[PDB]
């Protein structure tokens, strides 16, 4: 049975849609040629990081009043330290063909993102906004801007750089920001005003890595694609555009995107929109969330680490350790180690010494007077 | 039949291969995900793109 | 075995070694590709963090002012200068008698300014306010 | 003045107020530049690990490392630091470099 | 999900 | 590129090409409040060839 091709009109071939729903849907088993899109969002984290707090949630997506202290040193509080936002999406397991030593992982192709809530900035009538002049309207949200987002299969690799090492950031006490002092274990040295390779940290928590001190390390982030922007000014205007047609491609120069290690999609973003000028003259930053529509596909890969080496490397650590006399390292208790293979004609010197050159070829040592 | 891929399963034990973070709620009662779509193969074009089942 | 039975995976360049400057001593074949990730600190006249006293102003300059009377006698700390460096690369030719020699060629450079995210600090303890009771003036 | 030329010999000793890249003589090199004046004008910057810059010339050849050495030079001034007293001071930031190299026969 | 084994 | 729609550049008549330029960079705010313009030179690397006409 089949319909008449002439009697029946033809239509286009759009990609077939299997399912549309929430997070509980990713569990669906899909073929090797399937494609996944995830629409999600991240609220900003700028010191006031929770609306559930009964006392101080009036300033969610805001900071407390920013002021220079006036006397060294500086002691800023967490509520004045806006930090990056981050989240992880757990992806389902996939097949593997151990016979060919190849498995398959998720990769990201494209992300469709846009800053949400831009329309809310035209509110020039917040009851405490500083009038630009007498009998006038409010000073629109403007000034400093910082925008970045990062997509990768690993947590984003960061770099530490602070405008002044004299500042003393709050200590990490089971909560609170994490600063270079927390990573190194020492007070910040004036090297940190420049680039210090010692000051590096993976982005592991939300709202705990302030933007003032951390910046994306360009060296290590090879498995992540991050984009940035900034403008600094007293009351310079903020400009933003938005649409749902602009998409961004994440493939590299070699044709691969970020590979989700641990079947986890790592996302990080941060968007400052400007100041909130108050009648008191006091000032405070502000932010607003970000929209993400990451597209994912299935890519086959070859296991780089052969399983056998992992097995022994695993149980050895699990097996009870053995604290014997040192047999490796600086104080090894080993004197000679010889290695034989095959038969050769008898050489003259029985005290001969041979080794392998830096190029892997066989070499015979010519004896020399040891000083 | 072993339902679990061995390599993916064993790599979970290694830290650098399975990184974990304390990110925003993206799973459960407070999931910050609005929609998820799965595409496989091609079909004849449907009228409504926002199909309601 | 079983070539056709195995799935097909893409072909990417083969990573042969990864490490620090130590790697530059390593030789390699003719059709090789090397890639160097490095950095350079800014020399704003205050050019060393190790000095005892004046290092507090690293990556900065002393207070710039016009003298108000000719001539101008500026100190080095108000003269920001370029930042230069050279990296040593390994030799490529053991024989010179060969009609053709080979040298290192650079094709693409990936650059980025480090530490941009720090500029939002508008609360330096001595930073001038934009207005009374306001916040400090950002780096501009 | 053509007589006022020199080579970027050392670091922290060739001021920016005085020296500028001589366009005529920098043949085996590739340089890029930017500037903005203004007392309190905003500073804008962008960054990504996707922006690579091709160094090849119009004839299809890049810079050749004479003397088995790669020469790199950079300078980035970010802006002022308005102190409460009224004083003003410049500031700079480092740069990242990910040079890609190969072997050409000559 | 690998996260669920823990 | 100096070529026009017809793939023809400027023809150096009189066995010589002519160059003209002008670049101002801004004012010089003197302490007395007075002002004065300022300019910078230009480097030119004209590439040119022979054509039959
Ligand atoms: Ca790297
Ligand atoms: Ca020339």
Q: A198-226 b/e with 16+ CB inside 10 Å = b?
A: ebbbbbbbbbbbbbbbbbbbbbbbebbbb
Among the listed residues A112, A272, A264, A56, the one whose alpha carbon sits nearest the alpha carbon of residue B23: A264
CB contact under 8 A, E1 and A91: yes
> Distance between CA atoms of A286 and A45, rounded to whole angstroms?
10
Show the beta-strand stretches assigned E in chain A: 13-21, 35-42, 85-90, 96-97, 102-108, 110-111, 114-115, 145-152, 157-160, 200-202, 214-216, 224-232, 248-249, 264-275, 285-287, 290-302, 354-356, 362-364
Q: How many domains does chain A have?
A: 1
Quick one: tokens of F14?
């009189």
Which of A24, A27, A28, A90 to mutate to test binding with chain E, by most E CBs within 10 Å of its CB? Answer: A90
The SS3 of residue F15 is helix
List residues in chain F that are followed by a break over 2.5 Å (C to N): none
Q: How many residues does chain B have?
A: 53
CB contact under 8 A, A225 and D50: yes
Among the listed residues F45, F42, F48, the one whose alpha carbon sits nearest the alpha carbon of residue F20: F42
Kindly state whether residue A351 falls inside one of the protein's structural domains: no
Write out chain A residues lying below 8 Å of E3, CB-based. 90, 264
Domain range for residue A25? Answer: 5-302
Kindly state whether residue A345 falls inside one of the protein's structural domains: no
For C108, half-sphere exposure in the C-beta direction (CA atoms, 13 angstrom radius) is 10
Q: Please check whether residue B37 touches E, CB under 8 A.
A: no
> Distance between CA atoms of B50 and B39, rounded to whole angstroms?
14
Q: Which residues pair with A356 in a beta bridge?
A: A362
> Distance between CA atoms of C115 and A196, rounded to whole angstroms?
11
Cβ D80 vs Cβ C127: under 8 Å: no
Alpha helices in F1-53 (DSSP H): none
Burial of D60 (0-12, 13-18, 19+ CB in 10 A): exposed
> Distance between CA atoms of A347 and A352, rounded to whole angstroms?
8
Cβ C46 vs Cβ C54: under 8 Å: yes
Residue C129: DSSP 8-state: B
Distances (CA, A) of C123 to A67, A70, A88, C4: 6, 9, 32, 64
Cβ A261 vs Cβ A240: under 8 Å: no
CB contact under 8 A, A264 and B19: yes
> Distance between CA atoms of A293 and A38, rounded to whole angstroms?
5
Angle at D93 between CA C18 and CA C89, to 5 degrees: 35
> Distance between CA atoms of A224 and A239, rounded to whole angstroms?
27
Residue A49: DSSP 8-state: -
Quick one: tokens of D57?
């010339």
Cβ A212 vs Cβ C120: under 8 Å: yes
Q: Compute the nearest-CA separation of D6 from chain C (Å).
A: 13
Q: How was this structure determined?
A: X-ray
Alpha helices in chain B (DSSP H): 6-11
The SS3 of residue F19 is coil
Kindly state whether residue A333 falls inside one of the protein's structural domains: no
Task: Examine residue D43 and say whether the peptide bond preceding it is cis (omega within 30 degrees of 0).
Answer: no
Chain E neighbours (≥3 Cβ pairs under 8 A) are A, B
> Distance between CA atoms of A215 and A200, rounded to whole angstroms?
9
Kindly state whether residue A231 falls inside one of the protein's structural domains: yes
Among the listed residues A304, C5, C81, A63, the one whose alpha carbon sits nearest the alpha carbon of residue D15: C81
Report the binding-site residues of B for Ca(2+).
35, 37
Among the listed residues B18, A266, A254, A27, the one whose alpha carbon sits nearest the alpha carbon of residue C9: A254
Angle at A175 between CA A174 and CA A176, to 5 degrees: 135
Given CA atoms A87, A93, A97, A101 in this order, what sign does their dihedral have? Answer: positive
Cβ D70 vs Cβ A261: under 8 Å: no
CB contact under 8 A, C117 and A283: no
Phi, psi dihedrals of residue A300, rounded to the nearest 5°: -75, 145
> Distance between CA atoms of D62 and D65, rounded to whole angstroms?
10
Burial of F14 (0-12, 13-18, 19+ CB in 10 A): exposed
CB contact under 8 A, F45 and D23: yes
Alpha helices in chain A (DSSP H): 180-184, 307-318
Kindly state whether residue A325 falls inside one of the protein's structural domains: no
Kindly state whether residue A121 falls inside one of the protein's structural domains: yes
> Distance between CA atoms of A295 and A27, rounded to whole angstroms?
16
Q: How far is CA A368 from the centre of its chain?
A: 55
Show the beta-strand stretches assigned E in C5-44: 34-40
Kindly state whether residue A234 falls inside one of the protein's structural domains: yes
For A168, half-sphere exposure in the C-beta direction (CA atoms, 13 angstrom radius) is 7
Burial of A74 (0-12, 13-18, 19+ CB in 10 A): buried
The SS3 of residue A23 is helix
Distance from residue C84's CA to the centre of ligand 2 (Å): 22
Cβ A192 vs Cβ C114: under 8 Å: no
> Distance between CA atoms of F25 and F22, rounded to whole angstroms?
10
Alpha helices in C1-140 (DSSP H): none
Cβ A302 vs Cβ A96: under 8 Å: no
The SS3 of residue C46 is coil
The residues whose Cβ lies within 5 A of ligand 1, an ion, are A 219, 222
Q: How many CB atoms lie within 10 A of CB C28?
A: 14
Write out chain C residues lying below 8 Å of D98, CB-based. 35-37, 109-111
Among the listed residues C62, A361, C84, the one whose alpha carbon sits nearest the alpha carbon of residue D29: C84
Kindly state whether residue A310 falls inside one of the protein's structural domains: no
DSSP labels, A83-146: B-EEEEEE-----EEGGGTEEEEEEE-EE--EES-GGGGG----TTBPBSSTT--B--S-S-EE
Q: Do chains B and E touch (3 or more CB pairs under 8 A)?
A: yes
Place of tokens 């920016």: D16
The SS3 of residue A229 is strand
Write out chain C residues lying below 8 Å of D37, CB-based. none
Quick one: tokens of C98?
């060969």
Which of C25, C32, C81, C116 to mutate to test binding with chain D, by most D CBs within 10 Å of its CB? Answer: C81
> Distance between CA atoms of A138 and A146, rounded to whole angstroms?
23
Give Cβ neighbours of residue A185 (< 8 Å, ≥ 6 apart).
none
**Residue A290 known to bind ligand:** no
Q: C37-66 b/e with 16+ CB inside 10 Å = b?
A: eebbbbbbbbbebeeeeebebbbbbbeeee
Write out chain B residues lying below 8 Å of A40, CB-based. 26, 32-34
Least distant ligand from the CA of C36: 1
CB contact under 8 A, B9 and E3: no
Among the listed residues E6, E3, B4, the one whose alpha carbon sits nearest the alpha carbon of residue A89: E3
For D23, half-sphere exposure in the C-beta direction (CA atoms, 13 angstrom radius) is 8
The SS3 of residue B11 is helix
Residue A205: closest C-alpha in chain B: B22
């Amino acid at each position: 049975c089949i319909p008449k091709p002439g009697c029946c009109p033809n239509v286009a071939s759009v990609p077939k849609l299997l399912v549309k729903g929430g997070v509980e849907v990713l569990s669906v088993v899909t073929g090797e040629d399937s494609i996944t899109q995830i629409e999600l969002y991240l609220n900003p984290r700028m010191g006031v990081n929770s609306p559930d707090l009964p006392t101080t949630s009036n300033w969610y997506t805001y900071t407390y009043d920013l002021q220079p202290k006036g006397s060294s040193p500086d002691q800023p509080i967490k509520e004045n330290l806006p930090a990056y936002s981050v989240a992880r999406v757990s992806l389902p397991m996939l097949n593997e063909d151990i016979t060919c030593d190849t498995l398959q992982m998720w990769e990201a192709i494209s992300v469709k993102t846009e800053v949400v809530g831009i329309s809310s900035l035209i509110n020039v009538h917040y009851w405490d906004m500083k009038r630009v002049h007498d009998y006038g309207a409010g000073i629109p949200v403007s000034g400093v801007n910082y925008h970045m987002f990062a997509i990768g299969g690993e947590p984003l690799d960061l770099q530490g750089l602070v405008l002044d090492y004299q500042t003393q950031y709050p200590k990490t006490t089971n909560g609170g920001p994490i600063t270079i002092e927390t990573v190194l274990g020492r007070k910040m040295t004036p090297k940190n005003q420049g680039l210090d390779p010692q000051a590096k940290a993976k982005l592991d928590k939300d709202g705990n890595y302030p933007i003032e001190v951390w910046c994306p390390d360009p060296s290590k982030n090879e498995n992540s694609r991050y984009y940035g922007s900034i403008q600094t000014g007293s009351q310079t205007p903020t400009v933003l555009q938005f649409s749902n047609t602009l998409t961004t491609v994440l493939l590299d120069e070699n044709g691969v995107g970020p590979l989700c290690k641990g079947d986890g999609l790592f996302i990080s973003c941060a968007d400052i929109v400007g100041f909130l000028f108050k009648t008191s003259g006091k000032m405070a930053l502000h932010g607003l969330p970000r929209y993400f529509n990451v597209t994912l596909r299935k890519r086959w890969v070859k296991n780089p680490y052969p399983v056998v080496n992992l097995i022994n490397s695993l149980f050895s650590n699990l097996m009870p350790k053995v604290s014997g006399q040192p047999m490796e390292g600086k104080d090894n208790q080993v004197e000679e180690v010889r290695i034989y293979e095959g038969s050769e004609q008898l050489p003259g010197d029985p005290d001969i010494v041979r080794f392998l050159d830096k190029f892997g070829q066989e070499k015979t040592v010519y004896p020399k007077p040891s000083v």
